[PDB]
GTP-binding protein 10
Amino acid sequence: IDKLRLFTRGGSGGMGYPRLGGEGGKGGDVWVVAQNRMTLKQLKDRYPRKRFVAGVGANSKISALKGSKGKDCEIPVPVGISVTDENGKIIGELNKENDRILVAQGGLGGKLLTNFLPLKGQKRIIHLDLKLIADVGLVGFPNAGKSSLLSCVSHAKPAIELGKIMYSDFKQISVADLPGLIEGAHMNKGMGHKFLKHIERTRQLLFVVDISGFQLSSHTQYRTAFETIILLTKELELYKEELQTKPALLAVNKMDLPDAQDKFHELMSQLQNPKDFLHLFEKNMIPERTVEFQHIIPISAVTGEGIEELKNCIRKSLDEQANQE
RNA sequence: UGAUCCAAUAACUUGACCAACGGAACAAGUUACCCUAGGGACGCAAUCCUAUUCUAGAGUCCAUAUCAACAAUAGGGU
Ligand SMILES: Nc1nc2c(ncn2[C@@H]2O[C@H](COP(=O)(O)OP(=O)(O)NP(=O)(O)O)[C@@H](O)[C@H]2O)c(=O)[nH]1
Ligand SMILES: [K+]
Ligand SMILES: [Mg+2]
Ligand SMILES: [Mg+2]
Ligand SMILES: [Mg+2]
Ligand SMILES: [Mg+2]
């Protein structure tokens, strides 16, 4: 939640010298550099104006000619930055410190072709995305116990985010519990789609589905757990087809319910034969393809049931992916 | 528009980029090889750009933006 935007303008060139024929210095260029220890919010509250202008090329003197280029401006940003344009096209990616990208060029100097005038520079507007998502991304409906699952899986974490799963080998698996996955995603692509843009940069997806189904209101449709999974798959297909290529695991929560066993059995039957029930949904709700789950585990966030096995399965799946790649 | 002297002429008259123009009849460079007598240590305009301000207009919504015509003064060049 830190999407940024700046206005950049390269300085104009240098005024040439007509009688002799001297060129003026080229205008300063606009560059963005990757540095650590600072964040996008840090940049914003350092420079509230959000505008960067480089130097201006020196005019053509008579002691010297072909003037020196103006002092370029360097814009510091953190690592893992995606720089795009106002149209959203990705200008570049800065993944390591000292990565430098030119965004706006300075104006040319005062050549005779331009009547020795210092041609103006470039005006551009750039966007910043400080989002390099973790390896595991949690996807779940509201109240589907994503925060509770994160709190249970972490030694100590606030369940209202990013957390780490610790192993005996002192290995940490970086997980991201993303709230508001369904903030009218089918209707508000303005806010519930930044969630999908953040989650798209994750290697593994963990869907968390409540066993007791879900319902927004008494006047809203009661969708079962299988219906919730189908809705998740349809939303993923609508958002980005390439996201489904990543490995996905399923976790049916709230096993402490009295009917949880029968509900999970029914859900497993539906998973085994989904084609027999896909007609019940409209053609809009029918996904282009069905997501295959490497593992589906029943878990309970209250009784701390199956969490160790889920962590072991996640580690094994990550190891298998690494070995394959 | 040019004095004296001087020159020509029987006479009346005449002669000066003497222009350094109150005009010496006619005389140049270089000296670190030097010498002597002395004295001292800005505005006016057109144009092009930018530092700071206002905003006619354009879009801006989503823990996610603003740019900015015309001006206003402060300065740099042609
Ligand atoms: N009985 C029972 N209650 C559970 C279980 N898991 C979660 N809960 C309860 O259900 C609620 C979950 O709320 P919350 O932590 O906000 O989950 P969430 O999915 O992150 N909600 P949101 O997506 O809106 O942020 C809590 O009251 C929690 O105690 C479970 O396995 N069993
Ligand atoms: K004289
Ligand atoms: Mg939560
Ligand atoms: Mg005199
Ligand atoms: Mg007199
Ligand atoms: Mg000598």
